[PDB]
């Protein structure tokens, strides 16, 4: 199970925040301010997996924008790492050559592309056409 | 009111954090006020431009009903933010998020999928377990329905609702009759993680669940003779997600039964030889079939090619792929003890490698594969790396060192003075917690008292700034004084320990402002519990506990208090109560 | 961007030697290694041009450290410019030879500071009198040997009192890293 | 810098 | 003595910077903000930050961070007295100081940091004097430089000589929330514009009480300063000697004087509020305020700034005399009036929506400030009672005088 | 627009010789430590002259004055027979780099007024300078008091500064 995802900057800024857990909105700043500071203090070569409270923490960097996850005690880290993957590539055929900035403009658009790919921290759509279609669909119903 | 992307681009323009606090505030207050007319046309881009709010951490409680409005509406996109408003401010400690139970049922029997889909997706993402009770047979007459669409969000509200309420799982027992039949793969994933849930959560259907291991074994088999297919295909191979789900919930069936590991055996080693190891994907499959053979009793000439696959993962250059290695190691240490221990040097060798997590883990590892053969071998590079580390690891590392001393000690003496290395070289790392244990294992070292007594008395004759040092110290020194000393009555031959400054530096831990106030609580019961066993100085024991029974700290006080009170008027009766204890277990 | 600059830091001609040392000083100063640059901007220090001269001695002040055993070519126009007619300029190269932090040069400057700690101009000679806590920081015994102790404590009785404050504030920071004998 | 493309190509 | 002086930004990258001593290393200014922010994080922020050996005593301007640094036991006083002279320097060389005024003008910047401290220790930080010899469009060091007159150049001369005089008051004023005053003070200043010719001595007249019981004619109206603080000009000796205020004036615009007196008057303002706070509907404000100066003066431009909830929505105003508009980026309503009269008493109605769901967090009390402007009027009934001006070669300059109360720190506590 | 250089030993009268070039008469010159750039207006072309000191610490610096001339002044004093062994080493390791070849070379062999002095040929086939190639040499008598060589050296550089009349 993915109990959060986070997107942040290289100045440590928030982009997008996903969270299937419960838990209080000072906590969830607290932790979101350590998890962040603890990604950005680490190097290029650093092996993308950080261990933070039996929770393994899968990252990955695409841009200046970053991407995170944090999984179980149960779950494969280089599946999340494809996980990633997947939600950049939906990004890709939403968008189209997606940048920071579409995320930034829209962010809303970014959260229905998590939510047609992982609803409760588990996949629901495991192929790429499909969860695409899915929101282009819903776009042009209005 | 203004758009969202120009509120973004009014958010991008600021210039500090106290004048993007400004225009948040004064955003959110025309966006109060819009809330307070009630406006059905521009709430949309309200609550969206609110949601930014609080996504850039900003006070959003009063969007939660505008929110629960925007769901009960009829428009679309209106329903999609008010759902995504749902799923970023309500949760399950906001109580205005069970006044959308109605709304979330009305929408599950809409005519629209998408709409259906949102409020399936709302729910499986938040629900909390107030919702789950009276909505489980609306996800479970989703449950049973031809859309696919519908079918995976129904199946992950289901996995949700067993996740949030537990006693809501055996209604969903027909709902999962030939499920495992369809053909789109993500009805197929969101099955088997269905599946895995309920047999991670109960054990009565395991081997009722046993019997659809050939079917997960035979669409293993079809997933992996796909060749290629443009659709569910990253780097080569086809359906990596469904297939490392498969590979999850075979590991959790047949772990104790036998004949769906022969079942299983067979795919087991055809998928953990036929699949590539050149990309991550492969290597993520290789790992969940390497936790699946290692987990389930598979057969023990594979287990073989197992302890091949781990060692080309070992010497991996990736270091996602030496982390993968070290864990999947250190998730079979308990299975094959023989067949871990040849890797022992490599392990060693990334002990020292500069990655955080790397080290972290081949500690873990170390430690897990700590046995009684040649414990002195690891236990020589366990407090080199103890010695030799930044000093977040000094902690997990000291603790490692007492339960790996504690389980595999092989004598007591050689027991003693590696607690005594680690307690005077890790020192503040350690955990107070673990005082107790200490203190437990030395009293049960019965047959050596006065050599770890005395080793504990020069430790602290050097410096005594290590809390949990100078609390074991105190304690065993205030117990077993009687043989620190030996034979000094009177004054005789110059000899190092001569029951004057043994106090001395008792007094000096009490008078310190280098202490956590309970290590002088230890030093104040020490000095009265010498009191009996120390026949030469008198009046000394007696003034120290005088001058001390007017602290600022209450249990000092009481302490001293009390023993004044036992010396000025029942001096003749602390043998009695200050004798020494029969050990415990 | 680096051998560029370095021809023409290297050419004759005197305002396009002023934009050079003008864009070294600007690399500097939005923070990057330009150390290597150092005897190209070095040998443009005796010039009538004193905006040109403040900045190589800013380029001398912050990069000789980095390169001690290479910036012993300074000296001869640091003691030439501590004589001209100019007290600003000599004030300032009194200033900037204090704040050159080698030791195998400071030798070699110890006559231009006596030279300045007596000259008729009070500015030069408050200049002067923090260049003596300067080359004590650096080379107390040198100081003792040379004797600059002695014109600073003559320094407090004179007259034009911000002499005598920056007098008494090298005397007391001389003090304070003394180990309190004489 | 953020107008740059996520995926790496 | 500090080290460096470093001018930094909001992210704490170094805009210039500047080196004295060479005991701290130079690239210890990245340690400067991750110690800052986790500072502000504990609620331990303090002006002076230790990073083991070296000390970062900094201080903030309006976009800039003016960073000291030291080794040793430096004096802390003198480094902070240093840094804000020195941005009174940069804001009198520059328009204001920012963070793109250090990058077009990073020559003069460096030859004025070059010129303002010596190896841990100020030299010339006088901007007028230090405008003669070193300039952005260089000669010998002036004489004033070094004089005993270290303000004042010699060689000014001008058509008309002209001094203007300042006199401002600011009222302090910090009464509880039960409506008793526990504290109210007058500081005030004497700002002097100065127009003289050649080196003019001038002496300041002043109804002080020390002065008037030492004379004796101490029965007329006299102020009791409770202390003085006085400029680099004034003659502090035969101040304390005979009460005397001499001084040689610097050219242009100065502050000569700032006093400081208690005053037992009652508030000029005064302001009552009662909230009528409703839990999860709305909150009312019933603002009452008179003014209780005389009535010839006028205050104008008051705005009293009375604090809002920060989600509070939909704001309803009932005014008798001014105009009262919502600030949200305060979380505040000001009430502006215009002009106030003496024994005038005005009245404000407020009302605003509360949203039903609370906050997660409490909110906090600021007072009730007001913003006045009190012209022709002074509070403790100081007055100049003449500027002799005495110049060598002898003219008739013209002493111009006004009297301005504004407020200061004029805060009212609610409920 | 033109660059030379004149490089030598100590106590070589390297520095009164420049100023002699500037103004005419004679200063109290110390060892130099760093550089010397001084100009001279002379027969319509500009003059410029890098003198570098020559002290034992200060010797391998001079590796940057070698960029951008096309000019060389080589300044060896006529009393210290035990230190031209070391201008001999001093001169075959300083020519013997790839960088400075389109340059002139001018030797200034001084103080030719004491009875101790000699002419200019025995220094010049003991310096052997016909063993090095692709330049311009001869030796001429120089002195420091009376200002000699110095005005026929800028004239030679003068017609081996063009090609044309
Ligand atoms: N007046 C005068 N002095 C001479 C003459 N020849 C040699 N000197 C001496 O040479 C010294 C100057 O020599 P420079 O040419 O400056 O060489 P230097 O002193 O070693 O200094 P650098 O070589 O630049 O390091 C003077 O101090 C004199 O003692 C001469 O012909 N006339
Ligand atoms: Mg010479």
Same mark, same amino acid.
């Given at each position: 199970?993915?109990?959060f ?8 800024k928030?982009?997008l ?12 700043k607290k932790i ?7 990604? %950005? ?7 993308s997996?950080v ?7 899968v ?17 494969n ?5 494809e996980?990633?993957?997947r939600?950049?590539? %939906? %990004?890709?055929?939403y ?10 403009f ?8 998590l ?8 996949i ?5 056409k499909?969860?695409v279609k899915?929101?282009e669909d819903?776009?042009? %119903?209005? | 009111?203004?758009?969202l ?7 991008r323009?600021?210039?500090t ?19 307070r ?6 709430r ?26 925007l ?12 759902? *995504? ?11 205005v ?20 889909? *949102? ?11 107030e ?5 489980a ?8 329905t031809s ?14 609702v ?13 709902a999962?009759?030939?499920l ?8 197929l ?6 599946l ?10 395991l ?8 079917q *997960?074994?035979r669409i ?5 003779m796909?060749?290629?297919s ?20 075979l590991?959790?069936?047949g772990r104790?039964?036998?004949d769906?590991?022969?079942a ?7 998928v ?7 990309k991550?994907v ?5 790992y ?8 389930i ?11 091949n696959?781990l060692?080309?993962?070992l ?13 999947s ?9 023989n067949?871990?221990?040849?890797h022992?040097?490599t392990?060693?060798?990334?002990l020292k ?12 590892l ?6 009684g053969?040649?414990?002195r ?7 080199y790396?103890?010695?030799?580390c930044e ?8 603790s490692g060192?007492?339960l790996?001393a504690?389980?595999?000690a092989?004598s ?5 003075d590696t ?9 503040? /790392? ?10 437990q294992?030395?009293?049960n ?8 007594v005395?080793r504990?008395?020069k430790?602290? *004759?050097g ?11 105190a304690?065993?020194?205030?117990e077993?004084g ?6 000094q ?53 007696k003034?120290?506990?005088?001058? /001390?029974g ?19 008027? /029942?001096?003749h009766?602390?043998?009695?109560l ?8 | 961007?680096?051998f ?11 305002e ?7 864009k ?17 901007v070095?040998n443009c220090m005796?010039?009538?041009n004193l905006?040109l ?5 800013l ?7 980095s390169?001690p ?5 300074a000296?001869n126009?640091?003691?030439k410019?501590c ?7 000599r004030?300032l ?6 704040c050159?932090?080698?030791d ?5 400057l110890?006559?231009?500071?006596r030279?300045?700690?007596?000259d ?12 003596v ?8 015994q040198l ?14 009785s ?16 001389i003090?304070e ?6 | 810098?953020?107008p740059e493309?996520?995926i790496?190509? | 003595?500090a080290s460096?002086?470093?001018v ?7 805009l210039?910077?500047?080196?004295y001593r ?9 340690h ?5 922010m ?6 331990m922020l ?7 050996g070296v000390?970062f005593?900094?201080?903030?301007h ?7 640094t ?10 902070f007295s240093f840094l804000?002279?020195?941005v &009174?320097?940069?804001?009198?060389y520059f328009?204001?100081?920012?963070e793109?005024?250090?990058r077009?003008?990073?020559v003069?910047?460096?030859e004025?940091?070059?010129?303002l ?8 930080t006088?901007?007028?004097?230090l ?10 060091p002036?004489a ?25 008051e600011?009222?302090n004023?910090l009464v ?7 504290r ?5 200043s004497?700002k ?14 002043l109804?002080?009480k ?7 004619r ?7 300063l ?7 000009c004034?003659?502090?000796?035969r101040?304390?000697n ?18 400081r ?5 009652k508030? $000029?303002?005064?302001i ?6 409703h839990?999860?509907?709305?909150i009312?404000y019933m ?9 010839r ?20 105003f009932?005014?008798?005399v001014g105009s009262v ?6 979380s505040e309503?000001?009430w502006?009036?215009k002009?106030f ?5 005005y ?6 929506? $509360? ?17 006045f402007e009190?012209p022709?009027?002074?509070?403790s009934?100081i ?5 002799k001006?005495?110049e060598?070669?002898g003219?008739?300059?013209l ?6 109360? &504004?407020?200061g720190?004029?805060?009212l506590?609610?409920? | 627009?033109?660059?030379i250089?004149?490089?030598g ?18 200063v @109290?010159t110390?060892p130099?430590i ?7 207006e ?5 003059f @410029?002259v890098?003198?570098?000191?020559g ?7 001079w ?10 002044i ?28 389109d ?12 009875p101790?002095?000699?002419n ?5 086939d003991?310096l052997?300078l016909?063993?090095?190639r ?9 002195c420091? @008091?009376s200002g ?18």
């Amino acid at each position: 199970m993915i109990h959060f995802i986070l997107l942040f900057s290289r100045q440590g800024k928030l982009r997008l925040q996903k969270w299937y857990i419960t838990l209080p909105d000072k906590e969830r700043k607290k932790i979101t301010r350590e998890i962040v500071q603890i990604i %950005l203090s680490r190097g290029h070569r650093t092996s993308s997996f950080v261990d933070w409270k039996e929770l393994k923490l899968v990252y990955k960097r695409y841009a200046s924008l970053y991407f995170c996850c944090a999984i179980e005690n149960q779950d494969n880290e280089l599946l999340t790492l494809e996980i990633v993957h997947r939600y950049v590539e %939906l %990004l890709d055929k939403y968008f189209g050559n997606v940048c920071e900035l579409d995320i930034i403009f829209n962010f809303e658009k970014a959260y229905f592309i998590l939510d047609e790919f992982i609803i409760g921290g588990e996949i629901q759509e495991t192929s790429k056409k499909i969860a695409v279609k899915a929101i282009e669909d819903s776009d042009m %119903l209005q | 009111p203004i758009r969202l992307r120009e509120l973004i681009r009014t958010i991008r323009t600021a210039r500090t954090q106290a004048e993007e606090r400004e225009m948040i505030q004064k955003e959110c207050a025309a966006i109060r006020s819009s809330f307070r007319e009630e406006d059905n046309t521009y709430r949309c881009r309200n609550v969206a431009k609110l949601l930014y709010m609080h996504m850039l951490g900003y006070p959003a409680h009063f969007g939660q009903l505008e929110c629960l409005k925007l769901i009960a509406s009829q428009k679309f996109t209106d329903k999609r933010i008010g759902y *995504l408003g749902a799923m970023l401010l309500l949760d399950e400690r906001q109580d205005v998020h069970l006044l959308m139970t109605n709304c979330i049922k009305n929408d599950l029997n809409h005519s629209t999928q998408f709409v259906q889909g *949102l409020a399936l997706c709302t729910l499986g993402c938040m629900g909390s377990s107030e919702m789950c009770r009276d909505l489980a047979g609306e996800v479970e007459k989703l449950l049973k329905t031809s859309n696919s669409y519908l079918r995976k969000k129904a199946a992950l509200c289901a996995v949700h609702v067993i996740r949030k309420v537990p006693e809501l799982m055996e209604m969903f027992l027909p709902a999962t009759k030939n499920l495992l039949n369809e053909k789109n793969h993500g009805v197929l994933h969101t099955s088997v993680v269905l599946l895995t849930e309920m047999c991670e959560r109960s054990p009565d259907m395991l081997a009722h669940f046993r019997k659809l291991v050939p079917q *997960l074994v035979r669409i293993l088999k079809n997933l992996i003779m796909s060749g290629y297919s443009p659709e569910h295909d990253v780097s080569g191979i086809s359906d990596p997600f469904l297939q490392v789900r498969i590979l999850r919930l075979l590991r959790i069936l047949g772990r104790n039964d036998d004949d769906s590991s022969e079942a299983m055996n067979d795919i087991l080693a055809q998928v953990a030889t036929n699949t590539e190891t050149s990309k991550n994907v492969g290597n993520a499959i290789l790992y969940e079939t390497v936790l699946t053979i290692m987990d389930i009793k598979s057969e023990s000439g594979l287990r073989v090619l197992a302890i091949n696959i781990l060692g080309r993962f070992l010497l991996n250059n990736d270091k996602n792929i030496r982390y993968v290695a070290l864990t999947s190691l250190l998730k079979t240490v308990q299975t094959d003890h023989n067949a871990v221990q040849r890797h022992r040097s490599t392990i060693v060798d990334c002990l020292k490698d500069l990655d955080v997590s790397i080290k972290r883990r081949a500690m873990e590892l170390s430690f897990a594969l700590v046995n009684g053969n040649n414990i002195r071998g690891m236990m020589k590079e366990l407090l080199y790396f103890l010695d030799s580390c930044e000093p977040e690891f000094k902690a997990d590392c000291a603790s490692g060192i007492f339960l790996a001393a504690e389980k595999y000690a092989p004598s007591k003496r050689w027991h003693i003075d590696t607690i005594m290395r680690v307690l005077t070289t890790a020192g503040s /790392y350690v955990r107070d917690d673990a005082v107790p244990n200490l203190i437990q294992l030395i009293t049960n070292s019965v047959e050596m008292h006065a050599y770890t007594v005395q080793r504990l008395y020069k430790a602290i *004759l050097g410096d005594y700034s290590q809390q949990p040092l100078v609390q074991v110290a105190a304690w065993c020194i205030g117990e077993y004084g009687d043989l620190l000393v030996s034979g000094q009555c009177e004054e005789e031959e110059p000899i190092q320990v001569t029951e004057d400054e043994v106090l001395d530096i008792l007094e000096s831990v009490l008078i310190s402002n280098m202490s956590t106030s309970v290590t002088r609580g230890y030093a104040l019961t020490a000095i009265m519990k010498l009191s009996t066993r120390f026949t030469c100085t008198v009046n000394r024991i007696k003034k120290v506990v005088s001058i /001390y029974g007017s602290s600022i700290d209450v249990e000092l006080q009481q302490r001293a208090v009390e023993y004044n009170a036992l010396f000025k008027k /029942y001096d003749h009766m602390r043998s009695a109560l200050l004798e020494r204890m029969p050990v415990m277990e | 961007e680096i051998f560029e600059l370095k021809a023409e830091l290297n050419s004759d001609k005197k305002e396009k030697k002023k934009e050079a040392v003008k864009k070294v000083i600007a690399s500097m100063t939005v923070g990057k290694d330009v150390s290597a640059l150092f005897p190209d901007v070095v040998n443009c220090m005796q010039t009538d041009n004193l905006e040109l001269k403040k900045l190589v001695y800013l380029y001398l002040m912050n990069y000789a450290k980095s390169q001690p055993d290479m910036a012993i070519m300074a000296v001869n126009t640091f003691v030439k410019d501590c004589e001209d007619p100019n007290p600003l300029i000599r004030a300032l190269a009194v200033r900037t030879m204090g704040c050159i932090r080698v030791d195998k040069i400071t030798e070699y400057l110890c006559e231009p500071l006596r030279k300045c700690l007596k000259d008729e101009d009070p500015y030069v000679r408050k200049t002067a009198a923090v260049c003596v806590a300067k080359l004590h920081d650096i080379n107390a015994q040198l100081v003792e040997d040379q004797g600059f102790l002695d014109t600073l404590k003559d320094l407090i009785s004179d007259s034009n009192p911000m002499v005598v404050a920056n007098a008494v504030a090298a005397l007391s920071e001389i003090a304070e890293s003394h180990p309190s004998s004489n | 810098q953020e107008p740059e493309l996520l995926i790496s190509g | 003595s500090a080290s460096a002086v470093y001018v930094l930004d909001l992210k704490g990258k170094v805009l210039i910077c500047r080196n004295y001593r060479g005991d701290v290393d130079m690239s210890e200014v990245e340690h400067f903000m991750p110690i800052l922010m986790e500072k502000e994080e504990e609620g331990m922020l303090s002006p002076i930050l230790a990073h083991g050996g070296v000390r970062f005593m900094w201080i903030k301007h309006n976009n800039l961070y003016l960073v000291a640094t030291s080794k040793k036991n430096a004096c802390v006083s003198l480094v902070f007295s240093f840094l804000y002279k020195v941005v &009174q320097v940069f804001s009198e060389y520059f328009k204001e100081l920012e963070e793109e005024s250090i990058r077009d003008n990073f020559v003069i910047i460096y030859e004025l940091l070059d010129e303002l401290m010596d190896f841990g220790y100020p030299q010339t930080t006088d901007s007028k004097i230090l405008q003669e010899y070193i300039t952005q469009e260089a000669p010998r060091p002036p004489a004033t430089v070094t004089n005993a007159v270290s303000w004042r150049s010699e060689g000014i001369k001008y058509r008309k000589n002209e001094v203007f005089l300042d006199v401002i008051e600011a009222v302090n004023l910090l009464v509880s929330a039960n409506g008793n005053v526990l504290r109210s003070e007058i500081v005030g200043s004497i700002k002097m514009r100065v127009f003289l010719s050649g080196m003019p001595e001038l002496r300041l007249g002043l109804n002080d009480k020390v002065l008037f019981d030492n004379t004796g004619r101490g029965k007329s109206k006299s102020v009791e300063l409770e202390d003085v603080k006085f400029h680099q000009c004034v003659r502090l000796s035969r101040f304390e000697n005979d009460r005397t205020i001499s001084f040689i004036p610097p050219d242009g615009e100065f502050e000569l004087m700032s006093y400081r007196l208690n005053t037992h008057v009652k508030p $000029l303002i005064w302001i009552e509020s009662v909230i009528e706070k409703h839990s999860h509907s709305r909150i009312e404000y019933m603002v009452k305020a008179k003014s209780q100066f005389k009535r010839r003066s006028t205050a104008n431009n008051v705005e009293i700034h009375i604090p809002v909830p920060n989600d509070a929505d939909s704001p309803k105003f009932k005014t008798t005399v001014g105009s009262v508009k919502w600030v949200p980026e305060n979380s505040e309503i000001v009430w502006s009036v215009k002009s106030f009269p003496g024994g005038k008493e005005y009245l404000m109605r407020a009302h605003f929506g $509360l949203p039903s769901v609370e906050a997660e967090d409490k909110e906090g009390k600021p007072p009730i400030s007001v913003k006045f402007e009190i012209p022709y009027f002074t509070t403790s009934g100081i007055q100049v009672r003449y500027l002799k001006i005495i110049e060598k070669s002898g003219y008739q300059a013209l002493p111009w005088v006004r009297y301005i109360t &504004q407020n200061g720190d004029y805060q009212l506590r609610t409920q | 627009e033109m660059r030379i250089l004149m490089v030598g030993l100590d106590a070589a009268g390297k520095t009164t010789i420049l100023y002699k070039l500037k103004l005419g008469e004679i200063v @109290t010159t110390i060892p130099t430590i760093g550089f010397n750039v001084e100009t001279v207006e002379y027969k319509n072309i500009s003059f @410029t002259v890098w003198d570098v000191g020559g002290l034992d610490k200060i010797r391998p610096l001079w590796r940057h004055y070698f960029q951008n001339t096309q000019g060389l002044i080589f300044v060896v004093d006529s009393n210290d027979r035990e230190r031209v062994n070391e201008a001999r080493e001093e001169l075959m390791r300083m020519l013997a780099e790839d960088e400075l070849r389109d340059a002139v070379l001018l030797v200034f062999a001084n103080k030719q007024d004491l009875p101790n002095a000699m002419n200019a040929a025995e220094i010049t086939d003991k310096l052997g300078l016909h063993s090095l190639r692709h330049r311009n040499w001869y030796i001429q008598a120089t002195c420091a @008091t009376s200002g000699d060589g110095l005005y026929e050296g800028l004239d030679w550089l003068s017609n081996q500064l063009r090609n044309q009349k």
